């Protein structure tokens, strides 16, 4: 909405949640890469795809409920009902990727990138790794064999169960 809300949102968030927000909003701004969260929010406002409901949903995806209670003056029940009724902006693929990347520690990602180093050529995070894999057209909402196979290979079966659940849902 107004610039006050955007400024407060930019001031509240820390760096990791900023990176997660950038990854989540990467899909809608697929053509222009925003360097800062301020530029991303300005681009969304200019394109007309940013509203009160969309901003509330985006803040809910990052799991920042205090901002919803404080800035937007909304509770989680209302935004949940709006999500259940109105179509959502970010796809289920992006939120699934965020869920998977949230539960991976700093040691498993090193093993995963060591396993993936055959297909490519440096403190990486799982979000950067999945972005890099997407750039090479290897992991997509249609093709998920690679990630499931490597997640099984490193003895992590709960994430494989999550991926199977996502595939069953769609």
């Amino acid at each position: 909405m107004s610039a006050e809300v955007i400024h407060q949102v930019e001031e509240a968030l820390d760096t990791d949640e900023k990176e997660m927000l950038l990854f989540l909003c990467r899909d809608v701004a697929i053509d222009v890469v925003p360097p800062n969260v301020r530029d991303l929010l300005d681009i969304l406002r200019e394109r007309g795809k940013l509203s009160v409901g969309d901003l509330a949903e985006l803040l809910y995806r990052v799991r920042r409920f205090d901002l919803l209670k404080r800035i937007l003056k909304m509770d989680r029940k209302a935004v949940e009902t709006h999500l259940l009724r109105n179509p959502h902006l970010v796809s289920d693929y992006r939120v699934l990727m965020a869920e998977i990347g949230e539960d991976l520690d700093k040691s498993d990602v090193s093993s995963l990138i060591f396993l993936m180093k055959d297909y490519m050529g440096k403190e990486k995070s799982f979000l950067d790794l999945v972005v890099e894999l997407e750039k090479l057209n290897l992991v997509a909402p249609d093709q998920l064999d690679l990630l499931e196979k490597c997640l099984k290979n490193i003895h992590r079966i709960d994430l494989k169960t999550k991926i199977q659940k996502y595939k069953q849902s769609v």
């Binding site: 003895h155 992590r156 079966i157 709960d158 169960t161």
Partner: protein
């Protein structure tokens, strides 16, 4: 929060020796590298939950592990399961997930005293260096070292029988029973 509370309550009771026994008994599922940093029951429970073998719906592995270490009170208190039902479930083929080889190794470890442990250490000084035969080592460490040096396994048991024949005959009976069952 009830399931995690129950798991924490179960994990509080166990002591260091039971922790070491549990760590040894799960070698087929947790490698050495992940085994090393484990210092308490919570870490082992998290490791098991990572591989999707312990959860609310599936609790057979934890019950079997508690039964195999002669902890019946925990099974009857914090898991609400009786000994006879667990024995019947274990007797069903395929239900047991821990190989009987590890079970018999742990039983042999139980059936050896300190003097017998020293005699066993002295009896196998030829194939094992003195450093691996340190005083702090127990029989489980010796079994792990022998497994590493591929001198003790499913297909090779001559050395085990040869060494154990000089201590007691009940161990030979257990080995023969395992061989007959296999």
């Amino acid at each position: 929060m009830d399931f995690s509370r129950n798991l924490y309550d179960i994990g509080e009771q166990l002591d260091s020796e039971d922790l070491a026994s549990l760590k040894f008994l799960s070698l087929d599922y947790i490698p050495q590298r992940k085994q090393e940093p484990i210092k308490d029951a919570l870490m082992l429970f998290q490791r098991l939950q990572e591989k999707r073998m312990l959860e609310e719906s599936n609790l057979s592995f934890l019950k079997e592990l508690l039964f195999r270490i002669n902890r019946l009170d925990l099974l009857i208190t914090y898991l609400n399961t009786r000994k006879e039902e667990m024995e019947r479930e274990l007797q069903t083929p395929g239900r047991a997930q821990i190989s009987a080889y590890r079970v018999m190794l742990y039983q042999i470890s139980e059936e050896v005293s300190r003097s017998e442990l020293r005699s066993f250490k002295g009896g196998l000084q030829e194939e094992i260096s003195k450093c691996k035969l340190d005083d702090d080592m127990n029989l489980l460490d010796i079994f792990i070292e022998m497994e590493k040096r591929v001198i003790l396994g499913e297909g090779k048991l001559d050395i085990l029988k040869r060494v154990c024949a000089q201590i007691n005959k009940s161990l030979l009976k257990i080995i023969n029973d395992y061989e007959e069952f296999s």
